[PDB]
C-alpha cells in the first residue's frame, strides 16, 4: 500500500566480474508521478551500493543509518566493509524494528574485497536472499523476475550484462503502471562503477 504509493522497482544482475544495478527514476504520490529524477540507489562507496523500494522516507532514513554504521565500522577496522557484511548489518537494522517494521525492501550490490560481484535483497524485516544470478524488488518485481529468468545466463560480459539487464528493466517497466520512464543503471566492476541513464516510453 505505502510501497505502491511511491512505486519504483530495482533490478540487480550479476555477470562475470561485474554487477548491473539499475532502477527507475520515478517518484510517486499514488497515480501521479511527482518527480522524474528520484534515484533510489545509494552509494556508500564505488564498490558498495544499495537501493530501497517502499516507503521513501524509510529508505532515506535507513540509508542515513546504514551510512552511520558503515562509517563507524570502517573507522573501527580500517578494512573496508564486505558487501555480505553490509547486507547482514542492514538485515540486523531492519529486524530491530520487528514489531514496527520498515515498509521497505532493500537490494545490496557491490564488489567484494576479492573484487567479485555480489548482490542480495531483504524484505521488510531483513529476510536476506544472497544472489548469484539476479534479484529484483518493487512494483515491477514479478515482470522483472520472469523476464530475467527468461533472459539471464551466467557469466555475462560487462556490456552484454548491461544490454540484457537494460532490456529486461525496460520491458518490465513497460508492463507496470507505476514503473517510471526515466531509468538509471549503475554498471559495477572492480575498477569502480559507471552511472548510465536511459529513457523509455516517456509516458
Amino acid at each position: 500500500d505505502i510501497s505502491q504509493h511511491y512505486g519504483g522497482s530495482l533490478l540487480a544482475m550479476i555477470g562475470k566480474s561485474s554487477v548491473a544495478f539499475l532502477s527507475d527514476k520515478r517518484l510517486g504520490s499514488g497515480p501521479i508521478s511527482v518527480s522524474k529524477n528520484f534515484t533510489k540507489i545509494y552509494s556508500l562507496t564505488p564498490r558498495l551500493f544499495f537501493g530501497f523500494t517502499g516507503l521513501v522516507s524509510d529508505g532515506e532514513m535507513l540509508f542515513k543509518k546504514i551510512r552511520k554504521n558503515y562509517n563507524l565500522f570502517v573507522q573501527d577496522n580500517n578494512k573496508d566493509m564486505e558487501p555480505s557484511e553490509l547486507s547482514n548489518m542492514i538485515s540486523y537494522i531492519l529486524y530491530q524494528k520487528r514489531l514496527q517494521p520498515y515498509y521497505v525492501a532493500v537490494i545490496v550490490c557491490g564488489m567484494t574485497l576479492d573484487k567479485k560481484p555480489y548482490a542480495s535483497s531483504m524484505d521488510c524485516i531483513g529476510a536476506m536472499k544472497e544472489t548469484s544470478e539476479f534479484v529484483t524488488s518493487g512494483t515491477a518485481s514479478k515482470n522483472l523476475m520472469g523476464l530475467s529468468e527468461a533472459l539471464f545466463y551466467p557469466e555475462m560480459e560487462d556490456e552484454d550484462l548491461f544490454t540484457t539487464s537494460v532490456q529486461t528493466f525496460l520491458n518490465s517497466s513497460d508492463r507496470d503502471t507505476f514503473g517510471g520512464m526515466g531509468f538509471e543503471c549503475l554498471l559495477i566492476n572492480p575498477e569502480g562503477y559507471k552511472r548510465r541513464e536511459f529513457v523509455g516510453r516517456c509516458d
Binding site: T45, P46, R47, S91, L94, Y95, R98, L99, M111, D123, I125, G126, A127, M128, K129, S141, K142, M145, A150, L151, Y153, E159, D160, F162, T163, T164, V166, Q167, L170, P190, E191, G192, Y193, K194, R195, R196, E197, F198, V199
Partner: protein, 218 residues
C-alpha cells in the same frame, strides 16, 4: 516448504526442500533451510524467514556462550527451552516453527517447536506446506532404523512434498547429526530438474545510453 526430521537409533536426519516463495512467485532457489545452532544441533524452520534465522541465531548464541563458558557441548533441551522462552512472550507474532534435532550426552533428540512456544519431543517430523504430503510417507515407512534407512525415508518424505505441494520444489538438503558428528548433503537430490534452454542475446545496439558518468574505486 517440506522441512522434515527423522530420529533413528544413534542420531537424527533433518531434510528440507530448497525453495522459498512469496505469494504465487518463487523467490529463491537452492535456499538453505537448515540453520546452524551447534556442532551437535541443527534447526530447520518454516514460516517468516526472518524469524527462523533470528530465533535460531539466538539459540546459537546462547548455546555457543554456554559451551564456551562451561566447556560442555549443549543439550537439545537447552536449545528448545531458549526458543520456547523467546517465542512464547510474543504470542506467536514472531511466527517461527522449528524442527530442532541433535545428539547430546543423553542421546539423539528431535523436537517440534511451534510459533506460540510449544515444543514436542518426537520420533519423526514434517513441517511446512508439504508436511501433510511428507507425514504420509513417514507414517507408512517409519520404523526403528539406522542412518542409511533413515536417510532414504526422510528423502522419500521430502520428495513426496516436493512433488505434491505447490509451494515446495527444487532440491533436497540433508543433514545428519550422529554420535560421530554432523555431516551435510547440500542439494542431496535434484528432483526438480529444469530444461536445457539455450541462451538469448540482444544486439548491443538495441539499447541507447543518454548520458554516462564514470567513477573510480580507490
Amino acid at each position: 516448504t517440506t522441512i522434515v526430521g527423522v530420529k533413528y537409533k544413534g542420531g537424527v536426519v533433518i531434510c528440507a526442500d530448497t525453495r522459498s516463495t512469496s505469494g504465487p512467485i518463487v523467490a529463491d532457489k537452492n535456499c538453505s533451510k537448515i540453520h546452524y545452532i551447534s556442532d551437535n544441533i541443527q534447526a530447520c524452520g518454516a514460516g517468516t524467514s526472518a524469524d527462523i534465522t533470528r530465533v535460531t541465531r539466538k539459540a546459537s548464541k546462547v548455546l555457543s556462550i554456554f559451551s564456551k563458558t562451561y566447556n560442555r557441548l549443549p543439550r537439545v533441551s537447552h536449545c528448545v527451552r531458549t526458543c520456547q522462552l523467546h517465542l512464547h512472550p510474543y504470542q506467536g507474532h514472531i511466527s517461527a516453527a522449528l524442527v530442532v534435532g541433535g545428539v547430546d550426552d543423553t542421546g539423539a533428540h528431535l523436537y517440534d517447536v511451534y510459533p506460540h512456544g510449544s515444543s514436542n519431543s518426537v520420533s519423526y517430523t514434517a513441517l511446512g506446506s508439504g508436511s501433510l504430503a511428507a507425514i504420509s510417507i513417514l507414517e507408512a515407512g517409519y520404523k526403528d532404523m539406522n542412518r542409511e534407512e533413515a536417510m532414504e525415508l526422510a528423502c522419500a518424505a521430502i520428495e513426496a512434498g516436493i512433488m505434491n505441494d505447490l509451494y515446495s520444489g527444487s532440491n533436497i538438503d540433508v543433514c545428519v547429526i550422529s554420535q560421530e558428528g554432523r555431516e551435510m548433503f547440500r542439494n542431496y537430490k535434484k528432483v526438480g530438474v529444469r530444461n536445457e534452454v539455450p541462451k538469448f542475446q540482444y544486439p548491443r545496439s538495441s539499447v541507447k545510453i543518454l548520458k554516462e558518468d564514470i567513477y573510480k574505486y580507490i
